[PDB]
Amino acid sequence: GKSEIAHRFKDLGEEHFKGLVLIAFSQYLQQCPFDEHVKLVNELTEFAKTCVADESHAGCEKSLHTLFGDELCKVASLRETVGDMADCCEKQEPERNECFLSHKDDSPDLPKLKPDPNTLCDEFKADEKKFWGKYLYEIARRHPYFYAPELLYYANKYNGVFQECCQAEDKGACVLPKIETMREKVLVSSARQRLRCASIQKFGERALKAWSVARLSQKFPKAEFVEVTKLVTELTKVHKECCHGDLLECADDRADLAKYICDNQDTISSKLKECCDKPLLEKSHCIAEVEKDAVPENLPPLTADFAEDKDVCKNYQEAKDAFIGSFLYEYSRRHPEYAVSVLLRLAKEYEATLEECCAKDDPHACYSTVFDKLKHLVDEPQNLVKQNCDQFEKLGEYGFQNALVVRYTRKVPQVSSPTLVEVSRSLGKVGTRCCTKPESERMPCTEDYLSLILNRLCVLHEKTPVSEKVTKCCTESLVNRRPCFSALTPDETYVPKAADEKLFTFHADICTAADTAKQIKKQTASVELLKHKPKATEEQLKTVMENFVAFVDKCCAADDKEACFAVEGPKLVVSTQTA
Numbered sequence: 001g002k003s004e005i006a007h008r009f010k011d012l013g014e015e016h017f018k019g020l021v022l023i024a025f026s027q028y029l030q031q032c033p034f035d036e037h038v039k040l041v042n043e044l045t046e047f048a049k050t051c052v053a054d055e056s057h058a059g060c061e062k063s064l065h066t067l068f069g070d071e072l073c074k075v076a077s078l079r080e081t082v083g084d085m086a087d088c089c090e091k092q093e094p095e096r097n098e099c100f101l102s103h104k105d106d107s108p109d110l111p112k113l114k115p116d117p118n119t120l121c122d123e124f125k126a127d128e129k130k131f132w133g134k135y136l137y138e139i140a141r142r143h144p145y146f147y148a149p150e151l152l153y154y155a156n157k158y159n160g161v162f163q164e165c166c167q168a169e170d171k172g173a174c175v176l177p178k179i180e181t182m183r184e185k186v187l188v189s190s191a192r193q194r195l196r197c198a199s200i201q202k203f204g205e206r207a208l209k210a211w212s213v214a215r216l217s218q219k220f221p222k223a224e225f226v227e228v229t230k231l232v233t234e235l236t237k238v239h240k241e242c243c244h245g246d247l248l249e250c251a252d253d254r255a256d257l258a259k260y261i262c263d264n265q266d267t268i269s270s271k272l273k274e275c276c277d278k279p280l281l282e283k284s285h286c287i288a289e290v291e292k293d294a295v296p297e298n299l300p301p302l303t304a305d306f307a308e309d310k311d312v313c314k315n316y317q318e319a320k321d322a323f324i325g326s327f328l329y330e331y332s333r334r335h336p337e338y339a340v341s342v343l344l345r346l347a348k349e350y351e352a353t354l355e356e357c358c359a360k361d362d363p364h365a366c367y368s369t370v371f372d373k374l375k376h377l378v379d380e381p382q383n384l385v386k387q388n389c390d391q392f393e394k395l396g397e398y399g400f401q402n403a404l405v406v407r408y409t410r411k412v413p414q415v416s417s418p419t420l421v422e423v424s425r426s427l428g429k430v431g432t433r434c435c436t437k438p439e440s441e442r443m444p445c446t447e448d449y450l451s452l453i454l455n456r457l458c459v460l461h462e463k464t465p466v467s468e469k470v471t472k473c474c475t476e477s478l479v480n481r482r483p484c485f486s487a488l489t490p491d492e493t494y495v496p497k498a499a500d501e502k503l504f505t506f507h508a509d510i511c512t513a514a515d516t517a518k519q520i521k522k523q524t525a526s527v528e529l530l531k532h533k534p535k536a537t538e539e540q541l542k543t544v545m546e547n548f549v550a551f552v553d554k555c556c557a558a559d560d561k562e563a564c565f566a567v568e569g570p571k572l573v574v575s576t577q578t579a
Contacts, residue, residue, distance in 0.1 A: 003060040004063060004064050005060065005064065008054055008064070008248045008249070010253075012252060015046065016152060016251060018133075019152050023146070023148045023152070024068060024134065024248075024409055025037045026140040026147070026243065027140045028068075028072060028104070029075065029085075030082065030104070030108050030141045031108070032075065037137060038133065039071075040075070044071055049294055053363050060122055062217055062450075065096070066093050067248075068097075068470050069097060070451050073089040088100050088103070097244075104144040106144060106459050107460060110141060110142055115176065117172035117176060118171050121162060121165070121553075123454045124159075125166065127399055131162070132156075133157045133158050135154075139155075143187075144198045145148050146189070146193055147188050147193045148250050149242075149250060149255075153282060154185070155280055155542070157182060158179075164491075176271070190363065191297075194455065194456070196208060196211075196243065197243040198458070200210065200239065203478050208330060209236050210347065211344060212236050213328045215340050216228050217328065218292055218335075218343075219269070219293070221296060221336065222269060222270070225325070228329055229577040231257070234257045258283050262276035270289050270294075271293050272287065275290055287460065292336045299334060302334060307368055308368065308483065312354070312364075316358060324351050325346060328344070328347045331346060332461070337440045339381070339444045339447030339448055340444075341448065341451050341479055342377065345449075345483070346378070348375070348480070353366070353373060354367065354370075367570075381443060381483075382443060385442055385443055387571060389435040389442070389446075392428075392431035392435050397429065401425055401523065402523065402526060404427050404428050404434075405526050405527055405530070408424055408528055409526075409530040409531065410490045410493065410534060411489070412469050413491055413494040414467040414494070415466060415467050415470060416526060417524060417531070421524050421527055422456075422460075423456070423457045423538060426456070430446060430449045430453065447455070447482065454474075454481050454485060457470065458481070461474065462474070473485050490535070496533065497531040497532050500532075504528065505572070506525070506564065507561065507564065508564040510552060513557035516537050522548070525548075529579070539579055541579065543579070544575050544579050547574060547575070548571065555568075
């Protein structure tokens, strides 16, 4: 309408508006205290209500970015506190939002929130709205690129948990297992949305548009290309809006897309009956995780249109992106077992083949073989998953994680020891997730989770570029990232770190930590060992690692740090003896 704040408030409703505004403020101004934020959401919400009352209340006409910008800037200590974002207050309307958005911290040094069952449950009975707000503020401040509409679903789910478990005598019993499941789901959606955001910022809307085509074409295999093009344009709008920090418009357009899908359900998928009889936020979430419908029976062979047809060249030249769009759609619909990443890589490779062949004379010769050429791209991933998965069966999660740490520290030896231990740990957890699965679904889960883990590596490394090899793999292409990292060979030009007792000296306290924490400490030492000696043999690293479990077991077993000092040093002295 005339006033966008009015339009958005009538469409979203006070409750969702207030939450979405808090999620926005919390995501941009990530360090400020919760109560300061609530004071601001309140004022903007009052302004919103004032607009819907009279659509001329001096200022109602401004853009949503002028309004949010203005309020954000009036936060004194934007310079003191969150810091150089205060520089950005100076600028005018387009530049203002862009600089603020650039000042999003993906690894904010904010506390890890330990849940306290009873305290939390009392905080709920006090005021439920505040409790819902604190959940939002907390997850948004720690994951600055979260899908605003989904954070709202997750918060409704958190309120539901406390509804059930607070009335229960044993609070932690109920709360702790349920909250931990939800935290895992929340962390995966953050990573997934950070991948969509990184795709739009670095690789273009073409890349988000093409991942959408694949995702949507796999899941909705009956949809004709017309409808998938419709959905992809509307879904890409939503992702582009959430990634740019236009959270109010993200939610309105996501809601509108779900209304659409549910209304046009006969054409889109037979599995959407259950999802579309639910309430607003749960409908949109249920639609995103829906069962891939059945591949329509008697679909042509893919060779027909994209290889054997004689006029392939004409068609591609006529309308490049529609043709390469149709390849992704037709291929993704026929192969629901491939991962989206592999499908996108197969389409990139078809684009390449077509360019080469389409310039050269006798293009039909060139292009008929395109499918045999593309078999390679499907096979390499399948061989990786078999090989790695075989290794996880032999070693267990911690054994697998440890051997992953040795592989990737040999490869990209310059990445911070804390980030090497985080990616290695997350990659070994892809053994638990993905390697006990039906063969059909193994490739989707592995390649999809690997992409999220590798995008985290890439995001964390962009902050402090240290390894040239990582920068090359993360900047080249989004789809070719996992293939690029698996192709990286042990670096024969890394000048070792240096013998340093400080990193390898294990003090007691290991014998008392949380087990997850004990694992990380011990894995952190593996990375430092590999950096002092890049040129070790596995046989030697076996000798060293068996000896270290001796020191931890022997020491912890016994009576003190005393031993954890007398004998540490000897192990250092034996490790050094060889490795």
